């Protein structure tokens, strides 16, 4: 029941299944009362530095409203998936729906 | 032999006690090198900017045999000769595309040694 903002980087070779992964996560998050209040896709951005060896990656922005179990389950998916790298989960006191990066 | 390298990179490892100039390619393969201590300057004269340019000039002409005319300067470390060695690269035939300081800066990492109680 806490608003979480998640930004994760997907490997450039796995850029075309970021839709397949996000559709899995959104389904897997709302099965216990979750809702997605925000979801963008910043696309293949040139990295300021190489994470491991890639200088470009698929950023995905997603703001959710979940519980402890759902957030731990989702964070588990990020950890045991080499496709995604350099993820960050934020806690928000309020839900937002603007873009602020696309423009 | 002649590698026939046109683009190079020059590294100046200037320190408080010695200055090591090393000319390398774009992939970090060294061709020539000279040091202030290797140019007849020992002791108080090894840590002087004049010894630095002598080292840079000595390695500079040793590097033209590869047919090198373009290089980027990568000066690293403090000391008397960080700039005096670069000015030596201009006296001999060369054009410097860029000058960059690559001195390593810890982000408060390993503990440095203690103050000298001289």
């Amino acid at each position: 029941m806490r608003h979480y903002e998640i930004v994760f980087l997907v490997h450039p070779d796995q850029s075309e299944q970021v839709g397949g992964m996000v559709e899995r996560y959104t389904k897997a998050i709302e099965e216990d009362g979750g809702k997605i209040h925000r979801l963008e896709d910043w696309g293949r951005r040139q990295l300021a530095y190489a994470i491991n060896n890639v200088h470009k990656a698929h950023y995905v922005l997603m703001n959710v409203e979940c519980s402890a179990k759902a957030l731990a389950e989702l964070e588990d998916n990020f950890r045991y998936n080499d496709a995604v790298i350099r993820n960050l989960v934020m806690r928000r006191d309020e839900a937002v729906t603007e873009q602020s990066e696309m423009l | 032999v002649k590698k026939t390298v046109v683009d190079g990179i020059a590294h100046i490892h200037a320190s408080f006690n010695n200055t090591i100039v090393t000319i390398t390619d774009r992939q970090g393969n060294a061709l020539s090198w000279a040091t202030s201590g290797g140019s007849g300057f020992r002791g108080s004269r090894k840590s002087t900017p004049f010894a630095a340019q002598v080292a840079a000039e000595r390695a500079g002409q040793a590097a033209l045999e590869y047919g090198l005319k373009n290089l980027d300067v990568n000066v690293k470390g403090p000391g008397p000769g960080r700039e005096s060695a670069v000015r030596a690269l201009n006296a001999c035939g060369y054009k410097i595309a860029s000058i960059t300081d690559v001195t390593p800066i810890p982000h408060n990492g390993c503990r440095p040694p203690k103050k000298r109680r001289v």
Partner: protein, 59 residues
């Protein structure tokens, strides 16, 4: 100019990033103490996601 400082908003972030990639002090920019504290946490947080370099000599 009612703008909220955030890590995605890179355009104003670069205004408070020095040429070498450091964070400019509040004295140079004349920023309020509250804004700079929230400004710094955005630069570091965006630094994590490879949006900004930690230093200019990255590589």
């Amino acid at each position: 100019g009612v703008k909220e400082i955030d890590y995605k908003d890179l355009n104003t972030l670069k205004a408070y990033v020095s040429e070498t990639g450091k964070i400019v002090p509040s004295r140079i920019t004349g920023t309020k103490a509250k804004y700079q504290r929230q400004l710094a946490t955005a630069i570091k947080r965006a630094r994590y996601l490879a949006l900004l370099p930690y230093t200019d000599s990255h590589g």
